XYZ file of C-alpha atoms in Angstrom:
443
model
C 112.717 78.019 60.960
C 112.300 81.109 63.148
C 109.339 83.429 62.666
C 110.186 87.045 63.522
C 107.462 89.462 64.617
C 107.653 93.190 65.174
C 104.890 94.036 67.650
C 103.334 92.629 70.796
C 100.063 92.319 68.887
C 101.679 89.960 66.373
C 103.486 88.008 69.096
C 100.393 87.052 71.080
C 98.819 84.482 68.712
C 101.949 82.329 68.791
C 101.588 81.803 72.580
C 98.533 79.609 71.778
C 100.490 77.350 69.384
C 102.708 74.302 69.919
C 106.122 73.743 68.277
C 106.910 77.326 67.254
C 110.300 79.125 67.034
C 109.576 82.861 67.425
C 111.694 85.989 67.762
C 110.362 89.376 68.878
C 112.531 91.810 66.962
C 115.117 93.950 68.787
C 113.493 97.120 70.020
C 111.564 98.754 72.833
C 107.939 97.799 73.507
C 105.742 99.732 75.961
C 102.599 98.409 77.710
C 100.509 101.184 79.283
C 97.031 101.427 80.869
C 95.502 102.240 77.455
C 96.693 98.787 76.193
C 94.294 96.971 78.634
C 90.602 96.531 77.641
C 88.124 94.624 75.446
C 89.435 96.044 72.137
C 92.898 96.544 73.494
C 96.149 94.626 73.084
C 95.560 92.828 76.462
C 92.023 91.942 77.419
C 92.968 89.381 80.104
C 95.631 88.611 82.684
C 98.094 86.970 82.544
C 99.354 89.429 79.934
C 101.584 86.840 78.218
C 100.123 83.376 78.705
C 102.385 80.752 77.091
C 99.944 77.889 76.525
C 101.858 76.035 73.826
C 104.586 73.431 74.281
C 107.926 72.668 72.636
C 108.448 76.326 71.689
C 111.365 78.749 71.719
C 111.016 82.516 72.175
C 113.956 84.861 71.556
C 113.798 88.304 73.149
C 117.399 89.359 72.494
C 117.678 93.158 72.592
C 113.990 93.447 73.533
C 113.156 95.991 76.236
C 109.608 95.443 77.493
C 108.400 98.342 79.714
C 105.210 97.546 81.618
C 103.573 100.495 83.371
C 102.621 99.534 86.927
C 99.170 101.095 86.322
C 98.440 97.839 84.469
C 98.404 96.080 87.887
C 95.162 98.022 88.577
C 93.432 97.427 85.221
C 91.954 93.973 85.955
C 89.668 94.659 88.882
C 90.362 92.930 92.184
C 92.233 90.111 90.530
C 95.808 88.948 90.752
C 97.851 90.208 87.793
C 100.726 88.236 86.292
C 102.910 89.576 83.507
C 104.060 86.176 82.196
C 102.723 82.721 82.931
C 103.893 79.487 81.294
C 101.292 76.695 81.183
C 102.807 74.517 78.445
C 105.841 72.285 78.540
C 109.345 72.151 77.155
C 109.537 75.882 76.308
C 112.603 78.129 76.323
C 112.213 81.909 76.768
C 115.454 83.863 76.482
C 117.092 87.235 76.931
C 114.125 89.563 77.690
C 114.735 92.793 79.620
C 111.442 93.479 81.415
C 111.035 96.627 83.561
C 108.055 97.652 85.676
C 107.630 101.408 85.186
C 106.549 103.460 88.160
C 105.611 102.223 91.644
C 101.816 101.935 91.459
C 100.500 99.200 93.740
C 98.340 96.298 92.463
C 94.605 96.503 93.107
C 95.035 93.059 94.726
C 98.485 91.439 94.170
C 100.881 90.544 91.329
C 103.590 88.103 90.402
C 105.881 89.016 87.432
C 106.493 85.485 86.100
C 104.781 82.211 86.995
C 106.210 78.940 85.667
C 103.780 76.018 85.550
C 103.966 73.037 83.171
C 107.100 70.874 82.947
C 110.602 71.183 81.575
C 110.488 74.931 80.871
C 113.504 77.202 81.023
C 113.697 81.005 81.355
C 117.275 82.124 80.651
C 119.120 85.440 80.297
C 116.227 87.597 81.553
C 116.801 90.922 83.302
C 113.735 91.773 85.406
C 113.079 94.898 87.496
C 110.020 94.504 89.755
C 108.139 97.529 91.128
C 104.768 98.504 92.595
C 103.389 97.106 95.876
C 101.955 98.219 99.210
C 103.019 98.990 101.860
C 106.531 99.512 100.514
C 108.982 100.392 103.262
C 108.320 98.025 106.199
C 109.195 94.559 104.942
C 106.860 92.075 106.667
C 106.650 93.889 110.019
C 102.957 94.731 109.587
C 101.908 91.535 107.877
C 102.793 89.203 105.013
C 99.688 86.972 105.025
C 96.301 87.045 106.714
C 95.488 89.034 109.788
C 97.740 91.911 108.788
C 98.226 95.063 110.833
C 98.624 97.002 107.553
C 96.839 95.351 104.627
C 99.105 94.568 101.736
C 99.150 94.492 97.940
C 102.165 92.322 97.324
C 104.135 91.988 94.119
C 106.603 89.107 93.822
C 109.133 88.321 91.031
C 109.453 84.750 89.757
C 107.126 82.038 91.076
C 108.502 78.642 90.044
C 105.962 75.801 90.135
C 105.463 72.780 87.875
C 108.070 70.079 87.261
C 111.787 70.435 86.262
C 111.347 74.184 85.722
C 114.605 76.093 85.391
C 115.535 79.768 85.959
C 119.064 80.191 84.523
C 121.496 83.141 84.201
C 118.920 85.817 85.080
C 119.179 89.115 86.924
C 116.095 89.752 89.143
C 116.130 93.226 90.772
C 113.223 93.923 93.153
C 112.041 97.310 94.516
C 108.731 95.672 95.544
C 107.281 94.089 98.674
C 107.154 90.409 97.694
C 109.391 87.444 97.264
C 112.074 87.857 94.631
C 112.247 84.166 93.581
C 109.994 81.638 95.228
C 108.743 78.071 94.737
C 105.225 76.714 95.300
C 104.159 73.155 94.388
C 107.381 72.934 92.361
C 108.928 69.510 91.828
C 112.635 69.466 90.895
C 112.958 73.224 90.309
C 116.454 74.566 89.588
C 117.658 78.162 90.054
C 121.120 78.505 88.514
C 123.504 81.380 87.844
C 121.098 84.113 88.939
C 121.753 87.514 90.530
C 118.856 88.375 92.887
C 118.736 91.748 94.638
C 116.509 93.800 96.948
C 117.214 96.778 99.172
C 117.297 97.419 102.930
C 115.921 99.828 105.540
C 116.705 99.942 109.263
C 113.996 99.542 111.865
C 115.381 102.741 113.442
C 114.513 104.589 110.226
C 110.999 103.080 110.290
C 110.587 104.119 113.972
C 111.626 107.675 112.987
C 108.217 107.935 111.301
C 106.760 108.573 114.767
C 104.538 111.658 114.652
C 104.376 111.781 110.821
C 100.985 110.110 110.417
C 102.466 107.277 108.340
C 100.745 103.873 108.270
C 103.150 102.484 110.859
C 102.803 105.613 113.032
C 99.011 105.145 113.037
C 99.359 101.624 114.508
C 102.060 102.759 116.997
C 104.547 100.443 115.216
C 102.810 97.311 116.593
C 104.058 94.406 114.492
C 102.289 91.198 113.543
C 104.816 89.456 115.844
C 102.955 90.858 118.856
C 105.360 93.609 119.968
C 106.370 97.106 118.959
C 108.961 97.096 116.167
C 112.358 96.940 117.887
C 115.192 99.288 117.069
C 118.540 97.937 115.975
C 117.754 95.655 113.009
C 118.211 95.982 109.246
C 115.275 94.664 107.210
C 114.790 93.949 103.539
C 111.943 95.706 101.818
C 111.512 92.449 99.866
C 110.587 88.988 101.155
C 112.724 85.926 100.275
C 115.607 85.927 97.796
C 114.960 82.222 97.078
C 112.188 80.765 99.270
C 110.368 77.410 99.005
C 106.849 76.721 100.273
C 105.293 73.528 101.627
C 102.163 74.178 99.632
C 100.883 75.685 96.429
C 98.914 74.870 93.306
C 100.347 74.070 89.872
C 99.005 72.874 86.512
C 100.750 70.308 84.268
C 99.122 68.689 81.200
C 95.587 69.807 82.180
C 96.012 68.434 85.754
C 95.555 70.754 88.790
C 98.035 69.751 91.502
C 98.290 70.830 95.140
C 101.538 69.882 96.851
C 104.686 71.023 98.660
C 107.815 72.032 96.786
C 110.141 69.031 96.447
C 113.730 68.353 95.365
C 114.929 71.976 94.829
C 118.433 72.724 93.547
C 120.147 76.141 93.745
C 123.505 76.532 91.976
C 125.916 79.473 91.618
C 123.455 82.253 92.620
C 124.235 85.568 94.289
C 121.467 86.942 96.529
C 121.779 90.466 97.956
C 119.579 92.487 100.400
C 116.612 90.112 100.734
C 114.884 88.760 103.877
C 116.628 85.420 103.252
C 119.280 84.211 100.862
C 118.243 80.567 100.347
C 115.444 79.161 102.490
C 114.292 75.672 101.474
C 113.315 74.124 104.849
C 109.616 73.783 103.801
C 110.508 71.788 100.657
C 110.537 67.977 100.776
C 112.934 65.600 99.043
C 116.574 66.348 98.350
C 117.708 69.966 98.959
C 121.029 70.862 97.297
C 122.713 74.302 97.321
C 126.122 74.874 95.858
C 128.367 77.747 94.886
C 126.167 80.578 96.209
C 126.947 83.979 97.693
C 124.542 85.753 100.050
C 125.258 89.383 100.900
C 123.511 91.735 103.253
C 120.450 89.485 103.785
C 118.579 89.073 107.094
C 119.416 85.335 107.010
C 121.889 83.331 104.927
C 121.007 79.616 104.498
C 118.061 77.660 106.027
C 117.405 74.436 104.081
C 116.147 72.264 106.979
C 117.931 69.130 105.723
C 120.223 68.405 102.781
C 123.485 69.885 101.493
C 124.903 73.418 101.414
C 128.374 73.191 99.905
C 130.910 75.751 98.702
C 128.601 78.599 99.731
C 129.257 81.919 101.448
C 127.362 84.647 103.270
C 128.325 87.795 105.117
C 126.873 88.473 108.571
C 126.213 92.229 108.552
C 122.413 92.087 108.963
C 121.699 88.576 110.238
C 123.059 85.067 110.747
C 124.670 83.135 107.871
C 122.929 79.923 108.995
C 119.767 79.113 110.889
C 118.159 75.784 111.645
C 114.450 76.439 111.185
C 112.924 74.053 113.748
C 114.025 71.494 116.273
C 112.781 68.943 113.709
C 115.682 69.867 111.330
C 117.717 66.696 110.812
C 120.638 65.979 108.485
C 121.587 69.513 107.499
C 125.121 69.270 106.135
C 126.710 72.640 105.494
C 130.050 74.140 104.524
C 129.659 77.924 104.700
C 132.251 80.658 104.387
C 131.544 83.747 106.495
C 132.447 86.385 103.897
C 133.981 89.830 104.516
C 131.264 92.410 105.258
C 129.562 93.964 102.249
C 128.780 97.129 104.331
C 128.980 98.179 107.980
C 127.558 95.717 110.506
C 124.030 96.294 111.763
C 123.071 92.807 112.969
C 120.509 93.008 115.782
C 120.090 89.213 115.941
C 123.251 88.858 118.070
C 124.294 85.687 116.258
C 126.278 84.571 113.240
C 124.508 81.177 113.316
C 121.738 79.472 115.283
C 121.998 75.703 115.402
C 119.613 73.020 116.639
C 117.810 69.843 115.650
C 119.864 66.705 115.217
C 122.506 64.875 113.179
C 123.958 67.881 111.344
C 127.481 68.228 110.031
C 128.408 71.909 109.945
C 131.667 73.608 108.895
C 132.151 77.367 109.029
C 135.208 78.990 107.424
C 136.287 82.640 107.551
C 139.323 84.958 107.263
C 137.549 87.566 109.452
C 139.636 88.817 112.328
C 137.506 91.759 113.498
C 134.691 89.882 115.254
C 131.784 92.139 116.337
C 131.273 91.811 120.088
C 127.615 90.711 119.762
C 128.180 87.877 117.229
C 128.677 84.235 118.159
C 127.756 80.790 116.902
C 124.829 79.585 119.054
C 123.959 75.927 119.610
C 120.470 76.162 121.145
C 119.476 79.083 123.351
C 117.270 82.136 123.008
C 118.002 83.812 119.655
C 117.376 87.596 119.688
C 115.965 87.310 116.152
C 113.673 90.121 114.950
C 110.684 87.755 114.344
C 111.247 85.389 117.280
C 111.279 87.676 120.332
C 108.855 87.348 123.282
C 107.548 83.919 122.159
C 106.800 84.967 118.565
C 107.132 82.073 116.097
C 107.949 79.781 119.037
C 108.822 76.668 117.046
C 111.629 78.660 115.332
C 113.526 79.451 118.548
C 114.563 78.006 121.913
C 115.010 74.413 120.727
C 117.439 71.629 121.504
C 120.403 70.494 119.449
C 121.746 66.926 119.670
C 124.430 64.876 117.851
C 125.912 67.679 115.785
C 129.400 68.053 114.315
C 130.504 71.705 114.445
C 133.828 72.507 112.769
C 134.483 76.158 113.562
C 137.353 77.198 111.239
C 136.718 80.828 112.176
C 137.540 83.301 114.938
C 133.910 83.596 116.040
C 133.056 82.487 119.593
C 130.689 79.570 120.212
C 128.008 79.386 122.938
C 126.681 75.890 123.671
C 123.448 76.453 125.592
C 122.137 74.129 128.290
C 119.667 72.565 125.765
C 122.580 71.361 123.603
C 123.888 67.795 123.966
C 126.412 65.578 122.161
C 127.902 68.453 120.168
C 131.340 67.607 118.690
C 133.148 70.939 118.376
C 136.557 71.585 116.798
C 137.723 75.195 116.725
C 140.707 77.404 115.919
C 140.429 78.646 119.522
C 138.573 77.104 122.475
C 139.142 79.984 124.976
C 136.086 81.808 123.505
C 133.789 78.731 123.675
C 131.254 78.532 126.447
C 129.852 75.075 127.159
C 126.698 74.921 129.252
C 125.404 71.755 127.564
C 125.554 68.019 128.196
C 128.237 65.571 127.014
C 129.719 68.030 124.508
C 133.298 67.583 123.204
C 135.499 70.628 122.541
C 138.919 70.227 120.816
C 141.364 72.845 119.445
C 142.651 72.643 115.866
C 145.713 74.446 114.395
C 144.480 77.279 112.102
């Protein structure tokens, strides 16, 4: 029942057909700049456009090497390596590596999943080639940038009931690693998602070199000179949901927020955020995840984080996004450090909004002197200093259960009220709020 093909050329016609079972034979396949053109293997982007439905594609033992020069071969357009437009497809086991670090002429996204009921499983993706690479988002991630960008993101999940399962996504590119736009009921499950880090002190050491950041005197899009003392990802989000986007299902163009995301059993390392779903609507559910060395652990706005862990070396394990957050239930283990601490945010968690039920658990006994659980107050977060992003800082918290089964101190700011705190120790809790309850628990 399976048709086997032995070249990319012979693969491409099947992507236009429904109800096919296709295998690209084990081997190595190289896409270079000479493969893009009118009489060339790829005359259009997306390179691999899966238009059919009800199809299965086996890429076991396939290594697909795509030279980053290809990101410049389509004019000023966005380039996407793989897009799925049909429904009910399964793509499995591909190892896809971007070769070199050439930046897109405009921007790129490795995989885009539209349609409904598709699954990408067993992929190993290495994403490269973007600009500027080395500053994270300090000089701009959208419009009005201080340094204009050519971003390149990994997997963009859209559509309906789309599933990324058991994949390894390694990014050495400035872009999100896995992100969701206009996606209804997406699921990310069993994935390992990894970026890399650079300190702001190392960025500031470019002074006098003539680098792009040196030429703008390190003035960030946040409205202040880049501060020393933080560790940034060179990527954007590990898993990040958007409140907007465009998708296509069954010939219908759809503009909507992400809704009903589920994240299960993922490990996210060295990204700007581990799991951020606050901008999605519907039910948010996160279970069984591990977040290591990210700038932020979990921010889902409302919903459930259960049986999840994060270390706190570079940023807080938990952050309420806005004072509008309501009904965020979380059970988070503060994991042993994955490297030396370099957390300039001066917090292990920042809590606010209302009607949350939050449990933190840890075996940590060496508590860095600058780290505490904050309920309300003025977070020294890299992107929220000096009034930057004002809705994301300095907000009230009300009617919150805080079970602190850790040795970290807790600081209840004057804008906190009706906080029910239980803690292993209460000697290191400061209470400047209103009608808060503090009670000791045994271990």
